[PDB]
């Protein structure tokens, strides 16, 4: 209950899927062309059984200029531009890309994948063979659960590009209006009646970010999977609005324990769906809350779990 960074250690039994950042670190070592080929290969195979939802109209508008620029290049330049993004080179295209929210980056690559499939953007060279390190990285990806596979792909996409500056322009999709109160569903969690946890889940499912933020302490933090804590209400609300629209949280069961100084620690396990895949991918998730004596959220961590065997009382 003293520091955010120490609260990171609550429920230390929780086995997170650290194969995801492990695999991203291996991927990040590869030659840029192998990075692009590997993801092409993974994307094609995954597409046999899983369809990515179309990017939103606003997103496509925001990425349109950069996409047109690439589409106007000769093939060799197209390949160079894509390598620049993978290498995190400092170029105007790489700076534009870095200014974008994850969803806008994902929609940019969704479009390039379609154009590559159609032959209008320089494809991976015919009969391309991956490097020794890259073939093993793809094998690991293809052995993971779908929820882990899609998190590896997202993390590879978000990592590309070049950030120059701390307070650079941030471009994101418009904020959706919250769900009308009448049509809202309420979660049920075995073992857990805590109103702060239930209101957390219900407000996020409703895209009601202004209500959700009011659950947190001023200095409180949210830790997304495999990322550092996002600290304080302005940064946490920014993150909700830019990155947390249209999720479906399906918590199942939890446990409630005392912590030092009248705090309470609560662990919930269940599933989450991203709007990119709807009901076809359910990620196995734990939430770890540290609530102050008044019930506000001092810390919440969201973990991608190593296997369904990490869900409480499988
Ligand atoms: C790149 C590339 C390509 C294309 C690649 C493409 C098109 C790839 C597309 C990949 C896509 C669309 C991946 C989407 C992943 C979404 C995830 C993991 C969301 C998780 C959300 C969670 C867990 C949120 C949970 C949360 C909960 C529960 C909270 O309680 C609080 C909020 C929080 C957010 C933390 C080509 C194919 C063209 C080849 C070349 C190439 O390189
Ligand atoms: Cl998402």
Q: What is the string of helix and strand elements? A: HHHHHHHHHHHEEHEEEE
Structural class: alpha+beta
The helix content is 40-55%
Fraction in beta strands: 15-25%
Q: Rg from C-alpha positions?
A: 21 Å
Protein name: Orange carotenoid-binding protein
GO molecular function: chloride ion binding; photoreceptor activity
Organism: Synechocystis sp. (strain ATCC 27184 / PCC 6803 / Kazusa)
Keywords: Antenna complex, Chromophore, Membrane, Photoreceptor protein, Phycobilisome, Receptor, Sensory transduction, Thylakoid
Account of the 3D structure:
This protein is of the alpha+beta class. It has two domains: 17-166, no CATH class; 187-314, no CATH class. Helix content is 43%, strand content 15%. A six-stranded mixed sheet has the order 2-1-6-5-4-3. Residues 36, 39-40, 43, 52, 106, 109-110, 112-113, 116, 150-151, 153-154, 157, 204, 224-225, 243-244, 247, 249, 272, 274, 276, 283, 285, 302 line the site of beta,beta-carotene-4,4'-dione. Chloride ion (CL) binds at residues 274-276. It comes from Synechocystis sp. (strain ATCC 27184 / PCC 6803 / Kazusa). Belongs to the orange carotenoid-binding protein family. It is found in: Cellular thylakoid membrane.
